[PDB]
Design a binder for this molecule. Structure first.
Ligand SMILES: *[C@@H]1O[C@H](CO)[C@@H](O[C@@H]2O[C@H](CO)[C@@H](O[C@@H]3O[C@H](CO[C@H]4O[C@H](CO)[C@@H](O)[C@H](O)[C@@H]4O)[C@@H](O)[C@H](O[C@H]4O[C@H](CO)[C@@H](O)[C@H](O)[C@@H]4O)[C@@H]3O)[C@H](O)[C@H]2NC(C)=O)[C@H](O)[C@H]1NC(C)=O
Ligand SMILES: *[C@@H]1O[C@H](CO)[C@@H](O[C@@H]2O[C@H](CO)[C@@H](O[C@@H]3O[C@H](CO[C@H]4O[C@H](CO)[C@@H](O)[C@H](O)[C@@H]4O)[C@@H](O)[C@H](O[C@H]4O[C@H](CO)[C@@H](O)[C@H](O)[C@@H]4O)[C@@H]3O)[C@H](O)[C@H]2NC(C)=O)[C@H](O)[C@H]1NC(C)=O
Ligand SMILES: *[C@@H]1O[C@H](CO)[C@@H](O)[C@H](O)[C@H]1NC(C)=O
Ligand SMILES: *[C@@H]1O[C@H](CO)[C@@H](O)[C@H](O)[C@H]1NC(C)=O
Lengths: 119, 97, 367, 131, 105, 130, 119, 48
């Protein structure tokens, strides 16, 4: 019942910006933090950043500082990820995830979106 | 056990009282646990038994609390026990003809 | 050593039986005889509903001892007693083993009035809450493992029908069977479909001949799903039969409903005929005007039908069946008539709770 | 682990949580208790509902003011905790029960608690300060 | 950052065996570990949180032990639908990172 | 002697009792202080309830001005000047009703209210700020 | 002005139970404790029990526990007394008496009824 | 030391309340979050 729905696939030129959305069904949106992970085809997952849907504070990895941006909207219960200045290494699958968030820290992500493939 | 006596070719009345001043869903079963007649809301609904055309109930007494059963032009095969169920209460009436 | 402390704002509730305001979506200019009642009983609806999904908690949803059903029932009696004025009404009063009484003979002017159902919400007041169970495999009773506090309910259309549920709310995954006590031979069995069955039902341009068409293949697969779910409770090898009725009044032995302000009585002997082992059906409906009332006991005369075509298309979504247990195979015969069972299949997953945010707890304060 | 702060579970959202964590989110189950033919029908009932909600909140605040806690949400008193009222370990009561289970359990003995919190505080702290 | 190493990367086993996969970190991470699995063409799902606690939903044939820099994921009985790619994720400090991916066949 | 507990005299039911016993039941007298027919009859009940709630709110705000918000009984810092009909404490708290007390103090009560408003909450404050 | 109004005289058989009511006029019924007392003819006064009409708590002597029961009704302001397993020694006249109740203690019985005769 | 800190004499003897509200118009929500959250819950945690 508790599911996450993402948007469709996109193909973009290098150096552009891409916007992907994640929507939450079946649970209250302002109660659990949201994580973003990417997999390149051929190797494992890699992590981007995570956001509180209540306060609006963000946390971004040191590798992609100033490269990705995370925003939110509570009337639609959606989270937006913006990736700027795309390269050839950014071809892969994006995933939004609901972290379990026990005791107000990170514990583990359990609900995943279907994925968004970009090239 | 309340035992009533009837004569062949006549009409017999069975009484099964209630405990309050409302309209409560009743039911009537034989010894084989087959519905003869019942009510739903303010409608009367008979059962698949052999007494379908010879069973009736007093309509105006459902608001009162007295919840009777009427048998017309009866035969010898109606001599059996009868269970009146109302408010999870089972009243046993025995009939001899 | 440890001392008592107070708490204002704790999340606890108890079970209550308070009243509710309706808050339907009225128009205040239309004389359909539902907007007139809704603009004398209901406030408008809030367009932003509040829904809070709760954490790891369970509650016991009873459905055959509900409180919203008997508060629905009085409102629908008030609506029907206000809107459809009978031409001649007969009721037996006789406040006092044999008590003799006559009948009242109340007469009134009976003009023709249009009639159409509208969705009616039921919205809890301040200081109360409504819990809703979202389990798709709900038995009807017992505990539910996923609750949610809703501000108020979905669109409930107060349909008035017997032997078929019309314009109702569908199920989630599969067709569902609800009963107060299975293997009891007296309690009504409510059947909820998973897909609607479309039915056209009309009197075209004597006057009391209305036909009523339903598709055969969709009804056949719906009854196949129904008998497949009834065979889960009955040993997976028994034969299941369907019969027409067994005697009774005219409003319970046939599909008795209303359309355009006309009392349609459609025969259903052409539907429940198949026996199950391990293109369009037309029905001869009569528009009747000497009926038995369902609000109370008594008889009511209405007007002769109006000239012109009377057409209505609806979605059959539910059934009211009843087992005929005896002494082997089992035969199910339809029924109903107790109108609470029409609204006990749409308020089947809701509970009214009283908030009480005042708790006490011991810990190690001083003074 | 890493953290970012608090979240908003909503109205009546922490019923399944433990009493060690539901007692921190007390402010959002307390704020929500206060929140011409069309004029004479849709106006009277809504005003009646608003007046009833205001009167209920003022009655609850009056009861707290009688209890000795004038405006505090969490407030703690002078009545000792009798052990006949069912006690457990402190970790078990503050970490292993919901508020629903505690309110279902203590509900036999609630009125004696209320009378003791009235009398043994505000008729015993007073009449000794008037000496 | 903190590097995560999984031993072995590739393994072949039959139905009904016992397998152990070792996750290793460069520094102490206490017990903040998460074990996931993933099928190709599908999103991953959580199996173990807090390095010892079973998620509600996964069968009880799985287990996870370990502390410090040494952790083990143990499958007691190998089922044919459990043949997936196994990840271990630490969450002691930023940045978060995953394992190398342990594929079984 | 033997006893069973307290009794419930009612609203304004202790006006004939002494001041030392009627001050223990201030809770009772503080609890009770808080279509054609839909146009006429309902709006008068609604106006009466609104007026009662607003009177209680104004009076509780007047108690909250003096630093005495919420509490039924509280203490202040003005001294009892001997010109305000001085008596022993025993005869005040044991031999008088509250009606006789407000008969005997009513010439000075506005001075008491002004001294309570000007001092305390404007003397404990503006001194704690410096 | 303050009076106590009861029911009529009763005659009952041994082994049965008898019911007597006492209603208050001229005073607030929930203000003073209420006593019940019996009289056999030619003997001295001997006492049954007393009840608070506000809390509903009852108190009876050491030789009538489980024999009489006292209840109250604040809507009609009537106190009910029931006597079970009637014998020949309980024949006599009945009185309900308002206690003066100064200082939350028993002081004296000033207002009386006119007596219910049981035999 | 931020939020436009001055000496208390200039705050309490020279400026009106309107200018003082216009000066901390941007920074009011941080002060409200410091009052409502993590102080009163912290203080009443320390009381327990
Ligand atoms: C849904 O319903 C479930 C019921 O099962 C609830 O789940 C539990 O919620 C609690 C919330 O406190 C979880 O506790 C948290 O996780 C850890 C539990 O301790 C484990 O890890 C430590 C690590 O050293 C081990 O030593 C220990 O043996 C356990 O293996 C801890 O990280 C936390 O517990 C600590 O909290 C504070 C920290 O200072 C102190 O009180 C103690 O030191 C305490 O040890 C933390 O509290 C628990 O893990 C959940 N799962 C279970 C029991 O399976 C959910 O809360 C509920 N959902 C919601 C939304 O409420
Ligand atoms: C109007 O109505 C009011 C109440 O409705 C009545 O007030 C009550 O008056 C009675 C007496 O008339 C009070 O009862 C008792 O007062 C006694 C006075 O003490 C003297 O007399 C006794 C006689 O035995 C001597 O032993 C004693 O040494 C004194 O000489 C005391 O016996 C009692 O007071 C004791 O207990 C109280 C606590 O309850 C202590 O504070 C005292 O110090 C003392 O130890 C007893 O109280 C009764 O208390 C009054 N009621 C109230 C509520 O106070 C009026 O009498 C009545 N009529 C008029 C005309 O006003
Ligand atoms: C504790 O409670 C019991 C029953 O509630 C009571 O009998 C006992 O006197 C109480 N003891 C104390 C010290 O409060
Ligand atoms: C006490 O009251 C008298 C009234 O005659 C007044 O003159 C005097 O100043 C008062 N004492 C004070 C206010 O200290």
């Amino acid at each position: 019942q508790e599911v996450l729905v993402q948007s469709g696939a996109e193909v973009k030129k290098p150096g552009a910006s891409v916007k992907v959305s994640c929507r939450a069904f079946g649970y209250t949106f302002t109660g659990n933090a949201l994580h973003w992970v990417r997999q390149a085809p051929g190797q494992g997952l890699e992590w981007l950043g995570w956001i509180n849907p209540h306060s609006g504070d963000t946390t971004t990895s040191q590798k992609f500082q100033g490269r990705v941006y995370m925003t939110r909207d509570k009337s639609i219960n959606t989270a937006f990820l913006d990736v700027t200045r795309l390269t050839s290494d950014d071809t892969g699958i994006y995933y939004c995830a609901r972290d379990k968030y026990y005791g107000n820290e990170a514990v583990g992500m359990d609900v995943w979106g279907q994925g968004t493939s970009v090239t | 056990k309340k035992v009533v006596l009837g004569k062949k070719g006549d009409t017999v009345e069975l009484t099964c009282t209630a405990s309050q001043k409302k309209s409560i869903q009743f039911h009537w079963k034989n010894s084989n646990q087959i519905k003869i007649l019942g009510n739903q809301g303010s409608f009367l609904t008979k059962g698949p038994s052999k007494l379908n055309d010879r069973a009736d109930s007093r309509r105006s007494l459902w608001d009162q609390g007295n919840f009777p059963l009427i048998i017309k032009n009866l035969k010898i095969e109606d001599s059996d026990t009868y269970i009146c169920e109302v408010e999870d209460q089972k009243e046993e009436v025995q009939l001899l003809v | 050593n440890l001392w008592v402390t107070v708490y204002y704002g704790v999340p606890v509730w108890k079970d209550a039986e308070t009243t509710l305001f309706c808050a339907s979506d009225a128009k205040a200019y239309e004389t359909e005889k539902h907007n007139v009642w809704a603009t004398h009983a209901c406030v408008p609806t809030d367009p932003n509903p509040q829904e809070i999904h709760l954490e790891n908690v369970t509650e016991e949803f009873n459905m055959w001892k509900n409180n919203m059903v008997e508060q629905m029932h009085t409102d629908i009696i008030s609506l029907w007693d206000q809107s459809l004025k009978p031409c001649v009404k007969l009721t037996p009063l006789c406040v006092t083993r044999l008590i003799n009484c006559n009948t009242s003979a109340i007469t009134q002017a009976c003009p023709k009035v249009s009639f159409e159902p509208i969705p009616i919400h039921y919205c809890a007041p301040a200081g109360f809450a409504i819990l809703k169970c979202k389990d798709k495999k709900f038995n009807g009773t017992g505990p539910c493992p996923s609750v949610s506090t809703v501000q108020c309910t979905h669109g409930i259309k107060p349909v008035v029908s017997t032997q078929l549920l019309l314009n109702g709310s569908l199920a989630e995954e599969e067709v569902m069977i609800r009963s107060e006590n299975i293997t009891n031979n007296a309690k009504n069995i409510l059947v909820q479909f998973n897909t609607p069955v479309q039915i056209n039902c009309t009197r075209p341009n004597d006057i009391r001949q209305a036909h009523c068409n339903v598709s055969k293949a969709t009804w056949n697969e719906t009854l196949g799903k129904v008998v497949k779910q009834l065979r889960k409770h009955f040993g997976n090898n028994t034969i299941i039969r369907f019969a027409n009725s067994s005697g009774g009044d005219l409003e319970v032995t046939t599909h008795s409903f209303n359309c355009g302000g006309e009392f349609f009585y459609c025969n259903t002997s052409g539907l429940f005929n198949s026996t199950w082992i391990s293109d369009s059906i037309t029905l001869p409906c009569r528009i009747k005007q000497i009926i038995n009332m369902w609000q109370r006991i008594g008889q009511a005369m209405y007007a002769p039908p109006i000239q012109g075509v009377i057409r209505c298309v609806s979605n059959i979504t539910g059934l009211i069946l009843t087992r005929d247990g005896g002494s082997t195979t089992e035969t199910f015969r339809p029924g109903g008539g107790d109108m609470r069972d029409n609204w006990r299949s749409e308020l089947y997953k809701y509970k009214v709770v009283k908030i009480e945010p005042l708790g006490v707890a011991p810990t190690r304060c001083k003074r | 682990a890493v953290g970012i702060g608090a979240v908003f579970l909503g109205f009546l959202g922490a019923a399944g949580s433990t009493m060690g964590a539901a007692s921190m989110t007390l402010t959002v189950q307390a704020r929500n208790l206060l929140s011409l033919l069309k004029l004479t029908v849709w106006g009277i009932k809504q005003l009646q509902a608003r007046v009833l909600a205001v009167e209920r909140y003022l009655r609850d605040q009056q009861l707290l003011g009688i209890w000795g806690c004038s405006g505090k949400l969490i407030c703690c008193t002078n009545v000792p905790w009798n052990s006949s009222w069912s006690n457990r370990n402190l970790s078990e009561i503050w970490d292993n029960m919901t508020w629903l289970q505690w309110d279902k359990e203590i509900s036999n003995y609630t009125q004696i608690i209320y009378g003791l919190l009235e009398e043994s505080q505000n008729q015993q702290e007073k009449n000794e300060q008037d000496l | 950052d903190i590097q995560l190493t999984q031993s072995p990367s590739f393994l072949s086993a039959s139905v009904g065996d016992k397998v152990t996969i070792t996750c290793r970190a460069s520094q102490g991470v206490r017990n903040e570990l998460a074990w996931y699995q993933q099928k190709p063409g599908k999103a991953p799902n959580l199996l173990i949180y807090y390095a010892s606690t079973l998620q509600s939903g996964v069968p009880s044939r799985f287990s996870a032990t370990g502390s410090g820099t040494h952790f083990t994921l143990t499958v007691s009985s190998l089922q044919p639908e459990d043949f997936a790619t196994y990840f271990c994720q630490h969450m002691s400090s930023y940045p978060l990172t995953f394992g190398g991916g342990t594929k079984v066949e």
